[model samples]
Target chain A: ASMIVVFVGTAGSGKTTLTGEFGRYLEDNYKVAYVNLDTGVKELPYEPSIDVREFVTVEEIMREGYGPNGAIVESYDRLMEKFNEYLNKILRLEKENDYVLIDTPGQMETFLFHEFGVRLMENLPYPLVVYISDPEILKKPNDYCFVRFFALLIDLRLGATTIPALNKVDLLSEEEKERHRKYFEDIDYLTARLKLDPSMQGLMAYKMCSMMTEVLPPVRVLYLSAKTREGFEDLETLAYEHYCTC
Target chain B: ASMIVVFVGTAGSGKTTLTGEFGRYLEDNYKVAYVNLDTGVKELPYEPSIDVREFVTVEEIMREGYGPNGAIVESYDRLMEKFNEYLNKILRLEKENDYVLIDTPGQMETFLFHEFGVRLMENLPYPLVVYISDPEILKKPNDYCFVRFFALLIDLRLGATTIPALNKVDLLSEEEKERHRKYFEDIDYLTARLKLDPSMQGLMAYKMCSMMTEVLPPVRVLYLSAKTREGFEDLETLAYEHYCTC
Candidate 1:
C-alpha cells in the first residue's frame, strides 16, 4: 500500500536530519519520494522531489520587511493556496512511490498551532505523523508531562496516527534510558509520576495528566538518534506498521 | 496613565511565579489589578481580579469528551465570545487602577499563534508584553537563535511593544549572563557570532539579524528571577518606563 510519513517537531528537534537519513534508508530498499515542507530550511542532505520553496521563499517576505517569525507564518499561510496542487502532485507520485516522506518546518507551532496545518489535514487523507522531540526535556517528571501534552496536541490537531519519538537519545543517561521505558507503559504510571506538592506546576501537571490515557492513543514512544543512526530501523518498521495498515 | 502588564511565555517559563511576585511587588507600592488568563491552572498563587475559567474551562471540556490540547484550544475558542467583555472590564479597571497585570497560559502559541492573543493586544491600549523565557535554552547559540525567532515572532504577531526577558537568571552562569548582554546588543554582534558555515540555519539567523534593528524596538531585555527576587524591581521599572510614559 502507498503511504506518506510526515515529520513534525519543535525547533531544533532533528526533523530535517531524520527526514534525510530515514528517506535515504527507505530509498535503498524501496522507491520513495522526499518532500521538503520547510521554506526556512538552510540545507538539505537529501534533495526533496517536491519542495515548498518552489512556491514561497523567506527572501520574498524579507523584501516586504517581514521579520523571521512573520516570514515563516506568512510563507506557510501562502503555501495553503497551492496546497491542493501540491497534494495532487504527491498523490500522482504515490502511484509509483512506496513511501512519501514529508519534513515539516522547524518551528512546529507555525504549522500545528495555526489554521494552515490543520486545513491540510482536513483535506488530505490518512498519513502517519512522527513527532521528534529532545530527550533532554523528557528526563524531568514535569517535563515529561509537558511533552505528553505536545503529542496529544498534535494527535488531536491532525486526527491521524501520531507516533512520539525522541531525538538524540544517546544524550539520555542510562537511568533516563530506563526511565523512557516506563514513560508510556501505563497512563496511571505517568499520571502517578506527577508530583503532588505545594508547587502550582505540579498541580497543573496532574490536572493535565488525569485525562492522559483517555485523550492519547496508546503508543510507545520510539527513541532514536540521528547522530548515532541508532534506532533507525525500528523507526521505519514502526512507521511501516502504522502506514501499511491504512 | 492607566496601563496593563502581560506576561507571555511557554510552558514552565516561570510566568505564574513572575506574575505573582511582580504583581505583588507593584501592589506593595501601588494599587494594581491581577488578571489570570490560564484556564488550565490548577491553583492561583495570587487572586486574579479577572479569571478566564469563569468563561470556559478544561474541566467542562472533559465532560464534552475533549482531550487535553483540544480542551485548551476549545476553551480559548469559546473565550473569543467573552473576550470583548473582558477587554471592556480591563479598560474599566484601567481607569481606577494604576496597573493591570495579566498572566497568560502555559502553551503560549494557543494564545499568540491565532487571533486570540493578537485580538487582545489589538483591543487593549498600551499594554506592554514581557516575554519570559527559559535561560537554559538561551545558553546554546543555535538554540538562542531558535528562541530569538520565537520572541521576534510574538513581537511581529502582536504588532505591539514586546520585551524579551530571561526567567531564572540566577541559574544562568556568569558566562551565559555575559552572552545574554551581547544577545540583544545589535544585529551585527548577533550576526557576526554565527559560525563560518554554509548551513541554511546559519543563513536564516544571518538573514533575520539583518533586520534586527528595524524590525525591533530599542528595548533592552530585563532579567529577573522569582526565586531570588533579583531584578524584579528592574522589570517594573522597565514596564513603568515603557507604559507610564503615556
Candidate 2:
C-alpha cells in the first residue's frame, strides 16, 4: 500500500500550499501523486493527479440554482456517487506511486459530517489525516483550546488517526512561533497558564485541555511554513512512522 | 437584565423551530424578544423583534457574485460592522423583556469561528448558549463522541455557559430515545459500549468520551420535540438557573 496522506483544515489554513510543498518534498525522494478533492476551489497551487473538478463542481451546481452552501453540499453528494470509479483510479495510482496526497475542500463539514467521508477513509489504505491549523487563530489561550478540541472532533468523526499541524509559521516571528509550539510540546505548562488566567474562559480552557492527556498521547504539533518548508523534515519523519507498515 | 438565550446548531438541527417553540413557552408568563441573526434565511418560523436580514441579506450578497460560503462569511462581516446599533436595540428590548431569544445562522462557523462571535457572546447580558443536536446524528456511538466534543468546542470557543440538548425526539421511538439518552446520562455505559465495537473507531470514541466526565458535570441532555414542545418545562427551569443570577 502506498502512503496516503489526506490534508484537512478550515478555510485558509494552507492545506493547498502544504499539499503542494510536501508533495514536492516527497518528490525529491519518491514518486508522488497529488489529488485535489475541493470541487469549490477555483484554482490550485499544484496540478492534481485525480481532481474532483473533472467530475462535478460547485460552480455548475450554483448555476443550477442551488445556493452557496447547497451547491458545495450537492457537489460532494454527486462526487460520492462517482466515487467508485474515482476509487479505482486512485487504487491504480497507489500501485504506481510511493505517496498519494489528497487536498480536501475548504468547508470541511461538507466532507467530514457525511457518512461518505468515513467510508472514504475506510477504503483508502494507510490513510493519515493531517489536520492543519493557522497559528493566527491560535494567538489567544482560548483559541488553542478551541482548535485542539476541534481537531479531536475531526479525529473521532472519521475514526482515523490525525496529526495536528500548525501551518504558515513563516508569518509568525520566532517568539510567536515558540509560544505556540510550547503549548503543544508541554501540555502541563499550557494547562497551568490557563488556570492562572483568572477569567471564566481560562477555567474552561484548563478543563478542556487537562483531560486531553488521558485520551491521547501528548500530540506533537509541527510548526511549519509551507512557503519556507521549515518543518517538512519533521512532517516527513512522522508520516513515515505511520505509513511504514510492514 | 434579560436572560439571553442563543440557539446554535448545525443546519437542520431545528434551531429556528426550537427558537419559535421555546420563545412561545416563555411568552406565557414573560415578555420575550426574538432576535434573528440568520441573514441567509429567506423565511423564519417566528417573527423577529430584531432581524439581521433588515441590515444584510445573503441573496443580495450572492447577487454580488460571492459563493455560498463566502456570502455567509461576508454577511457576518457586514453584520458586525453594524453590531453596535444592533446591540443598542437588543439592550433596549432587554429593558422591556424578561427574556431575549437569539437564533443564530445555520452555518454556525460563520458565527462561532470568528472573533466577532466571541465578542457577541461577551456583549450579551447573562448569555447562555443552547447547543442543539439532532438525535439521528447520535445513532452511532462515534456520532455521540463527535457531537459531545463539538458541543465542548462551542462552549470553549464562546467562553460562555452552554447547555447541550438533543432536538427532534418526536422522530425517534421511545426505545431509540432511551438508548440515545443513556449515552449522555451515563458516559461509562457509552464508553464501555464503544469499547465493545472492536473497530478502530470504537477505540477512538472510547478515548474521546472517557475523559469528558472530568471536564463537565454529567450533562443532562434534554430530549424533546420542537413540534410537541415536550421538554419546554425543563428547558424553562434550566434557563432560569443559568439566567436567574442573584
Candidate 3:
C-alpha cells in the first residue's frame, strides 16, 4: 500500500518548498507522486502530479467579489465539492507510486480548520502528517508552545499521525540550531524560563508544558532544512516507521 | 482606566458583526471606541474610530505582485512598523473612552500568530480577549475539542485572559443549541462519545479532553448571537468582571 504524506503549516512556513525537496529526496529510492492542494498559491516549487490550480483558483473566486480571506475559504469549499474526483485521481497515483505527497494550502486554517481537510485524510490510506514549523516563529518560548499545541490540535483534528519538524534550519546559525535543540530536548528548561517572566503567557506556559509533556504521548520534535536536506534521513526513517506500523 | 477588548477569530466567524453589536451594546451607558485592524476587509459592519485601511490596504500589497496570503502577511508587517504611532492614537482614545474595542484582521493568523499582536496587547492596559468560536464548526465532538484547545493555545500565545464564545447561535435550532450547551458543559460526555468514534481523531480526543479540562483552568464557553443581540448582556458583565479585576 502506498503511504500518504501531507505537508501542513502556516503561510510562508515553506510547505511547498519542503514538499518539492522531500519528493525529490524520496524519489531517489521510491516512486513519489505529488499533489498540490493550495488553490490560492500563485506558483509552485515543483510540478505536481495533480494540482488544485487546474480545477479552481483563488483569483477566480475573488473576481466574484469575495475578499482574500473569503476567497480562500470559498475556494476550499468549492474544491471539496469535487473531492471525489480528486480522491480518485490520487488513488490512481497511489496505485503506481510508492508514496503520495499532498502539499496543502499555505493558509492552513482554510483547509485544516474546515471539515473537508479531515474528510480528505479519512479517505486516504496510511496518512502521515509532516507538520512543518518555522523556527522564526518558535524563537520565543511561548511561541514554541503555541506551535506545539497547534500540532497537537492538528493531530486531533485530522486524526493522522503528525510529526512536527522545524523547517528552514539552513537559515539558522549553528548556535541558534543548538539552542532550539536544547529547547525541545528539555521542555522543563523552557517551562522554568517562562515562569521567570512577568507576563500572563509566561505564567500559563508553565502549566501548558506540564500538561503537554505529562498528560499526552511524548512528542519527538525533528529539526530539518528542506533546502540543505540536513535532517531528511531522519524524516524518511520516521515516516517509513509510522507507515509500516499503521 | 479604559479596558481593551479584542475580537479574535477565524474569518466569517462573525467577529466584525459582533464588534459592531458589542460596541453598540456597550454604548448604552459607556463610551466605546472602535479600532478596525483588518487591512483586507472590503467593508466594515461598524464605523471604526481608527481604521487600518487608512494606513494600508491588501490590494496595494497585492499590486506589488504578492499573493493574497503573502500580501496579508506583508500588510501586517508593514503596519507594525508604525506601531508607536498607532499606540499613541489608541492611548488617546483610551483616555477619552471607557472601552476600546479592537476588531482584528479577517485572517487571524496574520496578526495573532505574528509577534505584532502580542506587542500591541502588551502596550494596552487591562486587555481581555473575546475568542469567538463558530457553532457551525463545533457540530462534531472532535471539532469541539479542537476549538477548545485552539482557545487555550490563543490564551497562552497572547498571554491574555480569553473568553471563548460561540457566535451566531441564532443560526442553530433550539435542539442543536441544547446539544452544544451539553457538549461544553460536560467533558465526560464528549469524551465518551468520542471514544465511540472509529477515527484516529476520535480516539485522541479523549486524552485532549482530559488534558484541557483536568490540567488547565475550567473553560466557560458562551453561546451568543450578534445579529439578535442575544447574550450580549452576559458578555458585557463578563467583560466588566475581567476588566475590573485586572
Candidate 4:
C-alpha cells in the first residue's frame, strides 16, 4: 500500500509552504509525488504532480453571473467532480514514488465538514492523516475551542487517528513556548476544560505523539515551525517511522 | 418591537463570557432580560429568564443511548424547538423591558450556518446582530478564515448588518496591537491569500460598521477586552446607537 500524507489546516496556516518544504525534503532523500487539492489556487511555488485547479476557478464561477455565495458553492461542487478524476490518476501512477503528499485547501472544513474531504479520505490508500493548526492562535480560549471542535469533527468523520501539529512555533516567544508546554503537560486541566473523558487523555496523547516527538509525552501536542525549519525533521521522522512501512 | 442583541462567534471565542458581560452591562443601566440559546450548556452564571438547558442535557440524551456526537446534535435540535416556544413567552411577558439579550452557543456553523440562528433573526424582531471575534485570533490566517467565512454566511442568511467586534485587545502586546491594526487595515491582503476576491474588501468593512454607524462608512473595527473591561463602553454605545432605535 502507498503512503499518502494529507496536510489539513484552515487558511493562512502555511499548508502550501510546508508542502513545498516537505516535497524538497523528500526529493533529497526519496521520490515523492505532490497533489494540489485547492481547485481555486491560481499559483504555487512548486508544480503539483496532480493538479485540480485546471478544471475550475472562483473567478470564473463568480463572473458567470452567480452571486458570491452561490459562486463559492458551485465552484466547490465543480472542484470535487474534477478531484475524483485526479484521484484515479494518482492511483494509476502510485508506484513511481515513496510518498504522495496532498496539499489541501486552507478551509479545512471545506474538505472535512463537507462530503469532498470524506470522499478523499475514504478513497485514499493512506493509513495516516496529519491535521495541522497554528498553535499561536490556540493561546485563546475561543481559538482552542474551534480547533478542538474541528479535531472532534475530523475524528468523527475519518474514524482514524489524526496527528495534530502546531505550525509556526518560531514566531512564538520563549515564554510563550514554555506556556504552551506547560498547558499541554496538564492533562487533567485540558480534559476538564475541553470536557474530554479522563480515560481517553493518555490515548489521545499517544496518538498525537506518533506524529512528532517534540510533542510532549502524556499529552502529544507536537510543535513545528515551517518558517524556521524547527520541527521539520521531527515531523518527517514521525511520518517515516509510523506511516511509511515500505 | 423589543430591542434584541444576538451574540455570535466561533466555539470558545468568548461568546458565553461576552454574553455574561453584556447581560450585566444592560442590567446595570436598564431593566434587562436574559435568554440562553445553548441547549447544550450545563452551567451558566445567572438563572436565565428563558433557559433552553431545562429542556435538554448531555446526560439525558446520552442515557437515551445516543453517543456523544449524536447527543449534541439532538440537544441542539431540541433546544431550538424549545427556544421558539420560549421566544413567544418572553415577547409576551417582557414587552416593557428595556432590552432582551440572547446568549448564543459558540458553534458558528451549527448556530448560524443552520436555520437556528436564521430563525431567531427572522422571528425575534432583532434590529442588530453583534458578531464577536478575538482580535488575536483574527490576526491569524486560520481563525481569520473562520470569521470571514462566517461573516459571509451570516450576511447571505439574514441580510442583517453585522457589527464585527474584535475582542481581547488586552491579550496582545503593544507591538502586536499595532500589527493587528495594520492587519485589519489590510484585510484585502489576507482575503487574497485565502483565494477570495480582494474587491469585496470595502463592502465587507462597510457592512460590519453599518450595524453601528447610521451613515455606514468603512467599518473601523473596535478592540474589546472583557477581562479588563476595555472598550466595553464603545461596544455598548455602538449597540445602543444601532439597535435601540430599531
Best-fitting candidate, measured by lDDT? 3
User: In model 4, where do residues sit more than 4 Å from their true spots?
Assistant: A141-146, A191-219, A244-246, B1-246
Candidate number achieving the greatest TM-score relative to the actual structure = 3
Per-model root-mean-square deviation over C-alphas: 21.2, 2.8, 1.8, 22.3
At residue A100, candidate 3 shows an lDDT of 86
In model 1, the clashing pairs are: A42-B200
Chain B of candidate 3 vs. true chain B, TM: 0.94
Provide DockQ values for all models, in the order shown.
0.03, 0.43, 0.67, 0.02
Residue range B89-196, candidate 4, lDDT tens digits: 667735867777777653354454344555676676644667777663443443444454344334434545566667777777898777666655556554445444
List, residue by residue over B105-192, the lDDT tens digit for candidate 3: 8778777777668788778886888899888787678887788778888888877888888999888898888899778867668877
Pairs with steric clashes in candidate 4: A11-A106, A142-B12, A142-B13
Between prediction 3 and prediction 4, the one with superior DockQ is: 3
Candidate 4, what DockQ?
A: 0.02
* Candidate 3 lDDT, A78-177, residue by residue in tens: 8778888878888888889988889988778876767667788888887889899878876678777777778888888888888888988888988888
Location of the lowest summed lDDT over 10 successive residues in candidate 1 chain A: A208-217
What TM-score, to 2 decimals, does candidate 4 have?
A: 0.48
How high is the CA lDDT of each candidate model? 0.69, 0.77, 0.81, 0.58
Worst 10 residues of 3 chain A by lDDT: A210-219
Q: Between prediction 1 and prediction 3, which has the larger TM-score?
A: 3
Candidate 2: which stretches are off by over 4 Å?
A: A24-29, A53-55, A60-66, A77-80, A83-89, A212-215, B24-29, B60-66, B78-80, B199-201, B212-215
B147-188 per-residue lDDT for model 1 (tens digits): 555555465455456777888888778876877878764445
TM-score of 2: 0.90
